[PDB]
Ligand binder design. Structure first.
Ligand code: DHE
Ligand code: DHE
Ligand code: HEC
Ligand code: HEC
Ligand SMILES: [C-]#N
Ligand SMILES: [C-]#N
Lengths: 543, 532
């Protein structure tokens, strides 16, 4: 579950000459190898080949290893996490050789993307002046769902009560997630290619009113959520170049670009490629909360003054990915996934308050799930990609002191490969998917725990299994169920039945009160549906 | 060693052996002017996209015969053999070499504590008058001399890093910190019977600045060093030099907002209003206010200022930082209390170079801070009193000529009625060997050029051999005497000249075989208190 940097692998490059002891590749061969590198290798080895999950592959190292070593490693791989590209057939014998030779050659230098480039890509389709002054359509905007139709580079706006696909909008490239302005009027989508689209939900026919490119590869975006700063700013984070950008919340005008290149928090060594992961917005101060993966830093960026920029660079833990605020919206709890830790930041005081091991392998909470456990009090939960465990952490320093920032319980759900856990204040249920599980029976189902039945005795809570994929009537292909998302009232929860692009997918709506199938959304346009975001729950951070 | 890059169409490739040889030469001799990443600085950019258009022949010839503007004639001089020149020519046509970083591992490896705090004196054990002591850089000797400010006796000569750039004092005045251009930092305990280096550390490959914590309540808590390469600053324990926090300065330019791979750290001062360090980041034009109360949850204010920030100083009230964005002829003013940019004004002169500048009360204008220039003979005054003189605040109030161009340091003291201005880099020996002195009391600010007395400093030193350059005035603790360095070559005769401030007459000439290439001089009291 590492990033595929496809957009970077669409950029043609100049083939470098070969130095002493190295064979050269033609521009054709080199570009072929370059495409493969960014599409399949850069996620683990880095855009600059400096290393991340995988070891560094820079010439100073690879040339010492030699062609044979590289060829063998790419072909047979290793048990530590390196895929057997050759023996699996993923890469042909010729491609394997291209990659081995490619690794011996000077690394390609992907371009930077500064203000000049951003402003050039900046397009305002409808100036604020010309936009509606009130909602012109009759949609129940707060109950609307924005769904990522992954491979189609589109998003579907679906009605939360009728399940009608109101419209399908194009962005031109695969979108990762949707976020809403604090007023709920503007819908922001971040494309994997670094393209940001801003949609005005007040239009009779909602569409993009402004767009801008902020980098080459990106996965995160957020809006200003401090009271008084509604609709003032939007922020986007990139994998490449390593930077985040604060934009005007009404026009997308790029205001401030900040490089994330810097020192790792622990060994304090310079890191040339620190990717920006999750970005949240503080409700206690006019700040954005930015996760910087490889350096293990969480940045609290004050947007009240972009010229005299105040920031708090918090030393956390390396490999930060996703996370969410607790129920009170004061503490940011995030997964430093590779190290199995949850880092807790007090957004009011701007300081790290705890780092706890979950006892599980690779926690992946999404924004997590907050609920008042019957005996433990307020807790935040996360499931794991590496195993079947669900861990609960106390989130009430003042009210449940001894339980605060301590892993209170850990129990199994359906199986490993989980990606998202979900609940809502109006629900007594905790839903846990198992998207990446190798067993179709598991990956196509969801575990549901009854919060009301949770005692605090150490025994593993029972769960009901919902056959989501089966309910959708989809057996063809590899239909993986992913991410629960509630409607505005918290009475229904949606799940994506993510199938291949040339296969049938669906969205399944579950009645939260009965845990029975409510409705199945199917449409020829529903290609590879993944992330779903309810307007109200996203604008208010209700999870 | 670095992995040799391949050569593209038409251009020749070098073996790993050849390349690394040329690489060594580049970083040791060229990187200083052309930049570590070949992006350019004092010299033009030598990146492939430019060099290839020029061609091998152009590069070769330029490296051999050089040019008037500043390029050294490596070939003709013999500094580089014909082979080395060609090697450099081919080298310049190839992709830029990947420079070595210098992080925590490297710093801790160089970190040595010679005398642990617990083994140091608990009170001053020598009988020196520490506050009136002067720490003088003996540049080419890799030493500093501690000189008695009243008797002019050289109390001790200590080994330090090569070409120490400056000396800074801890707020209590007990600890002396020096940093060499190489990145080597030495911490000296002035309370020892025989003061010496109690701790040392290397913070980079090229460095110029070091400073101590000066916020009340934070005396002797921290020291901070800035590096040209790698682009970073490091906060160290004020008692042991333990490297606590390293921050990269690589980032975006304030105006065009474009990534810059080499933003060198220039001057670093310490706030008197908040527990913060004031860090100038040259190429990006950013001034950083770094809060040292919490190094884990690090608070900083990144102030967009002006590009090419170099040196500067606090006004008389110690609230406003006034710094020169030298290449753009601007003075940037930061309010250290509110943590914000207050003004940016053009001095009307070419390349302002204030050092820490000179604060004084102008008879007509009120509180002002002055700076002279490297590019011309002008002295500019900026108002520094928003409350008492609002109409004059942050405005260039006057500009008048001194001895000539090539000035580096301007100086005065609260007890002095004089404003001293050197002309160190002037090509004319008679000018570079003298200092201009203006009578502040006589300044009217009527638009006329104030008269100045010319002190023949070099002549007073009795040195004519090899054109000595007079540089940097520095006062004693009482502000009654001002010292100047008479800087001659390593194998030549140098001296320090002490001037009686009240009469502007020669007070004393300091000569000693050990006084090799004297440059910066720092009085303990005036440095610990930022009195200028
Ligand atoms: C940085 C980041 C965020 C936080 C966004 C924010 O805070 O606004 C995020 C969130 C998310 C969220 C947020 C859910 C939420 O409720 O907040 C979802 C649904 C999601 C669906 C997927 N993500 Fe995501 N995702 C990455 C990156 C990220 N994903 C990757 O790098 C990775 C591992 C590989 C890649 O090539 O992108 C990856 C793969 C996936 C998927 O395979 C998913 C399941 C399907 C898809 O569309 O690609 N990502
Ligand atoms: C960044 C910087 C500072 C601020 C330090 C601080 O805040 O602690 C500084 C200050 C200084 C100060 C500060 C004086 C003061 O009163 O604060 C002095 C004496 C000084 C002696 C010299 N400087 Fe300096 N100096 C540079 C850099 C700097 N010099 C250069 O990059 C430059 C232009 C080129 C070089 O070759 O290093 C340069 C040339 C010189 C000289 O020629 C001097 C005269 C002698 C030498 O050894 O290089 N620099
Ligand atoms: C993350 C899932 C990876 C992807 C995708 C790719 N590689 Fe990898 N690689 C990864 C790991 C964790 C390791 C180390 C495994 C170990 O036993 O320690 C590696 C290693 C390599 C190597 C050898 C490096 C060395 O031993 O110094 C090579 C040559 C290599 N990987 C190449 C490579 C290429 C070309 C890939 C794209 C086709 C690729 N890897 C993908 C993890 C991951
Ligand atoms: C600072 C004192 C310098 C050092 C040390 C080196 N160079 Fe330089 N170089 C410098 C200047 C100011 C200039 C421009 C001079 C002018 O007449 O305008 C240059 C120029 C060059 C060039 C030509 C660039 C061009 O015309 O586009 C080359 C090829 C060059 N310098 C190479 C070079 C090398 C290899 C050096 C180390 C041996 C070196 N320079 C040192 C200033 C300085
Ligand atoms: C996505 N995680
Ligand atoms: C020195 N300047």
């Amino acid at each position: 579950y590492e990033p595929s940097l496809d957009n970077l692998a669409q950029q043609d490059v100049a083939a470098p000459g070969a130095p002493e002891g190295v064979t050269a590749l033609s521009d054709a061969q080199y570009n072929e190898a370059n495409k493969i590198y960014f599409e399949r290798c850069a996620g683990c080895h880095g855009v600059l080949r400096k290393g991340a999950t995988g070891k560094a592959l820079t010439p100073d190292l690879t040339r010492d290893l030699g062609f044979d070593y590289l060829q063998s490693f790419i072909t047979y791989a290793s048990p530590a996490g390196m895929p057997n590209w050759g023996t699996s057939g993923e890469l042909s014998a010729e491609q394997v050789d291209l990659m081995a030779n490619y690794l011996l050659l000077d690394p390609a230098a992907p371009p930077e993307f500064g203000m000049k480039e951003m402003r050039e890509s900046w397009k305002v389709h409808v100036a604020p002046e010309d936009r509606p002054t009130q909602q012109e359509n009759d949609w129940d905007l707060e109950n609307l769902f924005s769904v990522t139709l992954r491979d189609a580079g589109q998003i579907a706006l679906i009605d939360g009560s009728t399940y009608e696909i109101k419209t399908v909008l194009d962005t031109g490239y695969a979108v990762h997630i949707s976020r809403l302005s604090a007023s709920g009027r503007y819908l922001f989508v971040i494309g994997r290619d670094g393209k940001v689209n801003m949609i005005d939900l007040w239009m009779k026919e909602p569409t993009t009113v402004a767009e801008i490119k902020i980098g080459s590869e990106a996965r995160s975006i957020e809006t200003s959520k401090m009271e008084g700063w509604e609709d003032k700013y939007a922020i986007a984070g990139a994998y490449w170049p390593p930077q985040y950008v604060i934009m005007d919340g009404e026009t997308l005008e790029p205001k401030k670009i900040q490089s994330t290149r810097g020192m790792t928090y622990d060994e304090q060594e310079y890191h040339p490629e620190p990717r920006v992961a999750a970005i949240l917005a503080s409700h206690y101060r006019p700040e954005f909360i930015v996760n910087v993966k490889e350096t293990g830093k969480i940045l609290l960026v004050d947007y009240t003054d972009l010229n005299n920029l105040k920031t708090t660079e918090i030393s956390a833990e390396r490999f930060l990915h996703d996370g969410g605020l607790d129920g009170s919206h004061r503490y940011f709890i995030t997964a430093a996934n590779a190290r199995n830790k949850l880092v807790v930041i007090d957004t009011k005081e701007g300081k790290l308050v705890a780092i706890e091991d979950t006892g599980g392998q690779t926690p992946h909470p999404g924004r997590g799930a907050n609920f008042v456990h019957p005996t433990f009090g307020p807790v935040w939960a996360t499931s794991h990609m590496g195993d079947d465990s669900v861990a609960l952490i106390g989130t009430d320093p003042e009210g449940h002191p001894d339980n605060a920032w301590k892993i209170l319980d850990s129990f199994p759900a359906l199986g490993g490969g989980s990606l998202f856990i979900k609940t809502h204040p109006n629900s007594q249920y905790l839903y846990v998917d198992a998207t990446l599980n190798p067993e179709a029976e598991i990956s196509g189902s969801v575990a549901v725990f009854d919060i009301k039945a949770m005692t605090g005795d150490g025994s593993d809570p029972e769960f009901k299994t919902l056959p989501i994929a089966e309910w959708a009537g989809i057996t063809e292909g590899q239909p993986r169920v992913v991410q629960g998302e509630f409607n505005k009232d918290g009475t229904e929860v949606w799940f994506s039945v993510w199938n291949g692009k040339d296969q049938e997918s669906a969205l399944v709506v579950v009645d939260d009160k009965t845990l029975e199938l409510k409705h199945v959304i199917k449409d020829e346009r529903l290609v590879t549906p993944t992330g779903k975001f309810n307007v109200y729950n996203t604008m208010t951070d209700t999870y």
